[PDB]
Amino acid sequence: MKTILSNQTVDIPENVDITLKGRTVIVKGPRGTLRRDFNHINVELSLLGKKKKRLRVDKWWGNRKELATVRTICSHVQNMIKGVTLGFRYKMRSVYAHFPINVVIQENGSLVEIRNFLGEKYIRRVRMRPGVACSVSQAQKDELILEGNDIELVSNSAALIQQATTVKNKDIRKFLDGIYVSEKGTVQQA
């Protein structure tokens, strides 16, 4: 069955404006600019209000598979609004049983040094994605704070760190050591 119209609207806040160039959404909030294209999805994007700034996504004559993309675009756009207004902050805890994992943050938070993961002498060098800054928190002893505007980039940077500290040739249920994403949140808390 092909459904005539599947549509869904996201509400743009006042401090952020959205500009459309075809299926290319440019989000210009107070924390920067986020730009991402959706030319791989055949949808219609429209800015509705001059007062409340509504963005509506429409799919005409869609099958089940391509109705699933309507809310995917809306969720991606809402993350752009969230990123440019509040930012994205991922907190990572470095858990270990015996050898403490020493983390050194190199230039501008773009390189992460893992020294003593499970006591081995190999040095792990993980590069942050562009626009993502890593830092060592001052609140808890073993935290890493990943801050950025794009949830795609911040979360993938966090996954790079987590997958770098992977135990091999041992029982992962017993050797739980590593750096894991503790919570996912924002900056500015609003």
Binding site: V95, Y96, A97, R173, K174, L176, G178
Partner: protein, 52 residues
Amino acid sequence: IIEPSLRQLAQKYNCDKMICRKCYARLHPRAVNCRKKKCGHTNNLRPKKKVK
């Protein structure tokens, strides 16, 4: 000597998971069907066995 709350966090990514009985795929705890073609997306799943 891992303090318990961080022990739970590590177990979230290492232990609290489902295993496909046909292709041993490591799945999220709420999985009902395996995500992999090579077993045919079977619903023959079992919990990952604990060290307890």
